[PDB]
Ligand SMILES: CCCCCCCCCCCCC/C=C/[C@@H](O)[C@H](COP(=O)(O)O)NC(=O)CCCCCCCCCCC
């Protein structure tokens with residue numbers, strides 16, 4: 001109890017889904033960055049092959065955590081970056097947010113594909129399909145090929161759930177929860193970008 005990462009995730013993101021759906025939504029950077037850090041333990045359930053993905057995501061979340069001590073909300077964070085004209089500058093808060101947002105969407109589609117792929121001990125199909133939908137349009141060739149290689153170093157479905165410390169029943173519940181919770185959040189984040197004419201495809 002409390003060594004169950006899927007449950008720390010579902011709880012944290014259900015709070016954010018309430019904030020985002022309520023009127024006049026103000027998403028705190030502390031609260032947002034914390035929930036994003038709760039995804040990081042999902043790496044280290046994967047092989048050593050995905051340590052390049054783990055470092056990149058964690059580094060970006062660390063930045064958002066570091067930003068959370070000076071910046072009030074996510075909106076304020078983006079506004080400050082527009083005003084400093086560094087939105088697309090490498091390592092900026094807003095740019096990291098966009099990549100992190102894709103990371104959340106990646107987890108979402110993966111959970112969706114995993115739940116569907118029940119009766120198959122291979123994570124090859126869910127992982128491949130989900131990466132193709134979320135990250136393939138944004139990653140260069142070398143990154144995409146390195147990823148397809150790392151797909152062979154993936155654990156089995158049973159072993160993933162074992163390391164996540166859940167049986168099939170509980171896992172499918174807390175995964176479906178995140179999928180439900182993250183959807184309005186991803187939409188909210190997408191809209192922050194679109195409503196400010198920043199785009200989301202860069
Ligand atoms: C269980 C199935 C796992 C499928 C494989 C997971 C897919 C993650 C592959 C991402 C490779 C990260 C290397 C790419 C780095 C950069 O090119 C970009 C842009 O960075 P910038 O130049 O702006 O500094 N980084 C990203 O797009 C961040 C993506 C990391 C988020 C990964 C989420 C993994 C989802 C959960 C996996 C436990």
Ligand SMILES: CCCCCCCCCCCCC/C=C/[C@@H](O)[C@H](COP(=O)(O)O)NC(=O)CCCCCCCCCCC
Nearest residue numbers: 135136137138139140141142143144145146147148149150
């Ligand atoms: C070390 C790996 C050895 C395998 C080499 C054989 C693989 C066949 C490569 C087929 C050609 C790849 C198609 C080219 C895609 C281009 O769009 C990209 C540039 O766009 P972006 O990456 O941003 O999507 N091509 C590249 O970035 C380089 C293509 C790699 C070609 C083989 C690399 C081997 C280099 C050997 C150097 C001594």
